[PDB]
Design an enzyme around this catalytic site. Structure first.
Site, short mmCIF file in Angstrom:
data_model
loop_
_atom_site.label_atom_id
_atom_site.label_comp_id
_atom_site.label_asym_id
_atom_site.label_seq_id
_atom_site.Cartn_x
_atom_site.Cartn_y
_atom_site.Cartn_z
N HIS A 186 -3.75 -5.37 0.01
CA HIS A 186 -3.21 -5.96 1.25
C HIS A 186 -3.15 -7.44 1.19
CE1 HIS A 186 -4.13 -2.08 2.86
NE2 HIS A 186 -5.15 -2.28 2.06
N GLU A 205 -2.06 -9.20 3.31
CA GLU A 205 -2.44 -9.68 4.65
C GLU A 205 -3.95 -9.53 4.87
OE1 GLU A 205 -1.76 -6.67 4.06
OE2 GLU A 205 -2.76 -5.28 5.50
N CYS A 235 0.82 -1.22 0.00
CA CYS A 235 0.00 0.00 0.00
C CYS A 235 0.86 1.28 0.00
CB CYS A 235 -1.07 -0.09 1.12
SG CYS A 235 -2.36 1.19 1.13
#
Ligand SMILES: NCCC[C@H](N)C(=O)O
Ligand SMILES: NCCC[C@H](N)C(=O)O
Ligand SMILES: [Cl-]
Ligand SMILES: [K+]
Ligand SMILES: [K+]
Lengths: 379, 358, 358, 379
Positions: free
Chosen positions: D352, D354, D268
């Site tokens: 993302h 994650e 990001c």
């Protein structure tokens, strides 16, 4: 598990449950036997710097409401109870106790053996204490706060609770049917009484208004000069917290009023200042009087009134100047409850004629003030 | 709490109304409503241990009977209230049918939930803390035993274990504002104990009969009072245990020490525990104290007078009969019968008319 | 919501299980689950206007039947759930019997509480603010009307008065992240309206039959679809009104504009209000739209094809009997009977065997 | 009436109800399409100075829980939703939403046409707005506050939300079975990754750990000088709020690492920086990307991944230096989504990997990183 803990100067600890705000509270600990009127009690400015314990187990059964506040805020330093009921159950309730307290940022604890505490207070007398509500209340820490508390003897609290600037009061008593009335018009009330705000209870004012008095509440430190200039019809001495003795500016101003022929009337603290102003001496009581079932005798008439009491200090009856006459005594311990200037149109009362939580037995004390005025005017 | 006797008045309307139908009443003192109410239920002498269930949870019609019992009160209403909460009814639900203030209702529902927890965790889940919390709410050891599926003695034993005992507070008319030289007590689960029992005198404990009921009236209370009066005069420290508000037995003037408590094994043992009386009299209060005899004795209680065993010999249909034959006295022909055809023959033996006790 | 037909198979076990028993289904879209839910209830074609009561409050056995219906779900479960709350059962109580997530349960309890208020305040109490709140939670004009003891039309008028009308949101697959050129809409009570009707063409609305049921199957939907295919091809702007998730009628491809709504007077009148169509077809979707015909007309809907009255002429037994008569056609002999013996005599007239309808 | 009101720069107003703290809130108003994961979104640092609007009507259905927090606090400026459910119904809930809000002292509004809002922001792009929640919310005031708002363009928010001190992290991912695991032992982790804290999400760190990485979190302005001293196995560039542009120190530092053979990877914000440090340019998106249903294609592999997105500023594809090769692109708008250094072991991802509320599709992005590490070690 929301812990809370109360620790007394003496080291005695009371482990319970947090029901109000988080934080600590320090003040003198008292007990009040009023089975009703807790909100009124909490909102009583006289309780400033005091941690209030209620003897009656269930506190908050009827929630709370604005109509039941005797001042702008909760003056009680902390609240100590045995049981906070599960729900408020009353047509009049607008907010459960907890919320109310939480709202007022009051530290409060429940679930402790209030009887044990009362017994201790009664037997060993007043004690300062500290309430700690939070995750892991530090006892030693609370002890310290309680210990470090300066004490109320010799503590001027009227100056701390008094109104910044003088103001007008023209609102009357509440009623079941209409609730709290709308403020009257100045032209709707015959008398003009100047009420010194030593930490005044709404009910006193309302009740005066009930008798045709337009008020002007003045800061405690207001000068007698400044006061006279207003050409009052009556001067009223309110109730309030702390020791009355160290309030020089009130004794002095009063003494002044006494040179005059203006009608003076005091309640509770006002009663003590009046006495001081007359050369009497005050003493701080062992545990004081806080409750709503206190029998007081109208010695003159030989009648009993059940009263509403809230005082930690008292007028010594054996140091009473002859210009001061005894009018009321406590049937519980013989302590002075009323006095009258022989020479002047001034008298006061230790108990609470306006009650507010309590029996209405002493309300007539009000009428006597009214006569006085009417007579003053005639002159 | 009022005491009724509808079972003795078969064809009588048993719904409560403006015309009284109760025969007595019990009273209780507790530091809280829950504790007070629970104590009252357990001293009512109706066989309750608190909120014992009236209808089965698996009963599919139960909600019907419950609704009925609530909407149109009978003597058992108090118990159906709890059953209603156990059954899923809400406080408002119950309010609507009973007009009983939610202030009271919520506390009962609360105890119901606590009962449900006890039932779930069982004895093993009865830790010091929890157990204390339950006692503080007025729970009887016997009710807790029922819920954990144990014998009351176990609950007891377990309390003893945790040094979990009640304290006594005294009545004083003033919320402790003033001291008292009187000894009018009630138990509770709190910090400070006001009992302050003497070491000085010889103590005699007198057990009352709880609420008045048909067959168990004033007559027993009178004997109880007499024993106190007589022995006090005699120099003994007299201790009275009873919970009927209507009687002289529960007048502070009647004895040296008054325990205004449920006349239960639980309650009485707690008192004996601290009083260490010289003797306990169980034959004056009627059926109530009488039924406790054996258990008291068994628990080390110095029960005086006619032994629980001798009482039993007379009260026991068989024991008795033996003695009778032993004394070579005259009883009426009798027979025990199990069956419905058994009787018909035994009947024949005995000779009509017959007295048929079930 | 599934659609059942148990009334056509009385001998059948009507309890819900792992083997499907439903004959159809309805779907609704709402900005909230409450709104979504209620819209489906009123679009189910079962005569519900939402949570219509199943049992009487004053029925002493009610809790018992409610209990049963909850523990062992039938096609009526939904309504009983609401009756449970009106009867004083808690959410927890209900959960335990049904295993339906509380998340949903709470929401229905809230609709109940809300209804009780409507019933207490009545029509006078139906101020704009409150009415709006009610609409926002999906209450039908019709449900309200019954609670308030007024006519559905009255609530509808009240709505007009207040300028309380739903807006239309569009289905787009992305939660408005991307613009859409499709006119797939649903009603809701919010701010922004996405209907953006055209002033441009002559529109034709086709009313669907709602969920399928025995006797009201795909055959009607088939007709609906054709009506749309043909007229749109003819140049009209075709508007489909339906809530059956299983059909081709409810495919955005099927028409120019799709209103995925309950096929009710209320919902239909609203679309018309803003669409101001040239004509409406109530003859292709079965009984559903048929029953609305008269009403719609009355309200000024531009109903095309065979007239609502013409339809009634045919439907009304009596009305029919006359056209036949007039026409000099042949009908089987009949008779409308009130009483039993009336029939037994009137039957001799007609001659057995007979076709007895109610 | 517990009023709440939200006003946009354009003077567009939404009147609803307060569901969090009492006060005012000002920030850039955004919209997130995420149907689940509101708590994780709330606790996303990237949200700092932003007023978060959720498109999915029912927000709060599952309550809240510690495990679902992506940071130590709530970064969102305010919260705008359509409906707050009567209850929370999930075995993992520890506190209802409103409560959580008030606790994090978050101004939140409910009951507004969020759809109306979303289409506005989509059509007219992002707008700065204000939420006022109280007795009598002053619309005029709100507009005012909204207009007065600086704006996020050219706003280094990285510095504001970064750690004060560096610190270690060796905690792995959450499992339904053992919840949040106990932090690992240093020895236990093979690699050592240095993570620049640009307002990093806890999951990134947990997921790294999961791949045998012992971390060392560092403030945003840490010097490459200082950093290299650490002899890092790899350097990681977390996500974070505001403009990345003005983050000079960040950029500078990175360029420095860009001279070395150390594997670098950003997510990001960390993605935009790398780009900037490479000679790329960043742009502020009309309304950006916030949701969890975003299709992104691995242009190299020609495979689609559904992803979790949260960014209002992107890297311009057209200005990329030759040393920069496109790796991923958005299937919604085709905007830049991934880049790789032709000449170095450096790469990044706009979305993302994650996730944290969201699809686990991009997870393997982490793998590449590891591989690089392992490869760097071999050397
Ligand atoms: N509780 C034992 C009684 C002692 C005493 N007079 C008191 O009232 O404190
Ligand atoms: N909903 C009416 C027109 C739709 C428009 N293209 C939009 O998505 O804004
Ligand atoms: Cl009868
Ligand atoms: K305690
Ligand atoms: K609104």
């Amino acid at each position: 598990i929301k812990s809370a803990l109360l620790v007394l100067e003496d080291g005695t600890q009371f482990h319970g449950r947090a029901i109000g705000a988080t934080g600590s509270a320090v003040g003198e600990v008292v007990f009040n036997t009023s089975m009703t009127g807790y909100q009124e009690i909490l909102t009583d400015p006289s309780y400033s710097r005091q941690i209030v314990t209620l003897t009656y187990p269930h506190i908050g059964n009827v929630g709370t409401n604005d109509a039941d506040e005797e001042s702008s805020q909760v003056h009680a330093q902390g609240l100590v109870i045995r049981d906070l009921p599960l729900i408020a159950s009353n047509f009049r309730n607008t907010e459960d106790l907890s919320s109310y307290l939480k709202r007022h940022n009051i530290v409060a604890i429940a679930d402790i053996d209030t009887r044990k505490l009362t017994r201790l207070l009664r037997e060993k007398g007043a004690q300062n204490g500290c309430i700690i509500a939070g995750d892991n209340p530090d006892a030693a820490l609370a002890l310290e706060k309680a210990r470090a508390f300066p004490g109320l003897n010799g503590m001027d609290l009227a100056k701390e609770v008094t109104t910044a600037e003088a103001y007008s009061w023209t609102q009357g008593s509440w009623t079941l049917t209409g609730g709290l009335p709308q403020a009257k018009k100045e032209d709707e009330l015959p008398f003009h009484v100047v009420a010194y705000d030593f930490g005044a209870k709404r009910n006193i004012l309302r009740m005066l208004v009930d008798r045709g008095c337009r008020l002007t509440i003045v800061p405690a430190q207001t000068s007698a000069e400044d006061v006279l200039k207003m050409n009052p019809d009556g001067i009223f001495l309110s109730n309030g917290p702390g020791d009355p003795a160290p309030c020089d500016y009130a004794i002095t101003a009063i003494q002044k009023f006494l040179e005059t022929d203006i009608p003076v009337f005091g309640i509770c603290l006002g009663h003590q200042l009046l006495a001081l102003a007359s050369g009497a001496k005050t003493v701080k009581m062992k545990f004081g009087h806080h409750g709503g079932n206190h029998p007081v005798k109208d010695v003159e008439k030989n009648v009993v009134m059940i009263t509403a009491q809230n005082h930690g200090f008292a007028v010594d009856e054996a140091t009473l100047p002859a210009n001061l006459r005894v009018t009321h005594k406590s049937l519980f311990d013989g302590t002075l409850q009323g006095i009258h200037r022989t020479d002047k149109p001034a008298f006061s009362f230790q108990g609470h004629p306006e009650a507010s939580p309590g029996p209405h037995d002493a309300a007539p004390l009000f009428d006597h003030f009214i006569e006085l005025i009417e007579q003053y005017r005639k002159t | 709490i009022p005491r009724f006797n509808f079972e003795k008045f078969a064809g009588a309307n048993d719904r409560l109304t403006t015309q009284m139908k109760s025969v007595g009443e019990v009273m209780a003192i507790g530091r809280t409503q829950q504790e007070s109410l629970q104590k009252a239920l357990r001293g009512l002498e109706v066989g309750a241990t608190g909120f014992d269930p009236k209808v089965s949870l698996d009963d599919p019609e139960a909600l019907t009977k419950i609704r009925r019992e609530l909407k149109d009160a009978g003597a058992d209403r108090i118990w159906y209230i709890a059953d209603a909460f156990r059954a899923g009814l809400s406080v408002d639900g119950v309010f609507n049918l009973t007009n009983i203030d939610r202030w009271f209702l919520v506390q009962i529902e609360e105890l119901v939930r606590l009962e449900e927890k006890v039932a779930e965790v069982g004895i093993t889940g009865l830790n010091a803390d929890f157990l204390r919390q339950l006692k503080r709410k007025g729970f009887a050891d016997a009710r807790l035993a029922k819920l954990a599926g144990v014998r009351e003695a176990e609950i007891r034993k377990l309390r003893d274990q945790y040094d979990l005992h009640p304290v006594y507070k005294r009545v004083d008319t003033c919320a402790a504002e003033f001291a008292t030289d009187t000894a009018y007590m009630y138990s509770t689960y709190e910090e400070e104990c006001e009992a302050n029992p003497s070491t000085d005198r010889e103590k005699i404990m007198v057990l009352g009969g709880g609420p008045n009921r048909i067959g168990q009236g004033i007559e027993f209370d009178y004997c109880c009072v007499h024993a106190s009066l007589a022995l006090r005069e005699d120099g003994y420290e007299t201790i009275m245990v009873n919970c009927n508000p209507e009687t002289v037995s529960t007048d502070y003037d009647t004895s040296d020490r008054l325990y205004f408590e449920p006349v239960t094994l639980e309650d009485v043992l707690e008192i004996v525990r601290i009083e260490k009386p010289k003797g306990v009299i169980v034959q004056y209060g009627g059926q109530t104290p009488l039924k406790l005899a054996r258990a008291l004795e068994a628990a080390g209680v110095p029960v005086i007078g006619t032994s629980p065993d001798a009482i039993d010999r007379a009260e026991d249909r068989e024991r008795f009969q033996h003695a009778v034959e032993r004394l070579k006295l005259k009883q009426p022909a009798n027979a025990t019968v199990t069956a419905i055809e058994m009787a018909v023959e035994k009947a024949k033996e005995i000779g009509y008319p017959l007295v048929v006790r079930p």
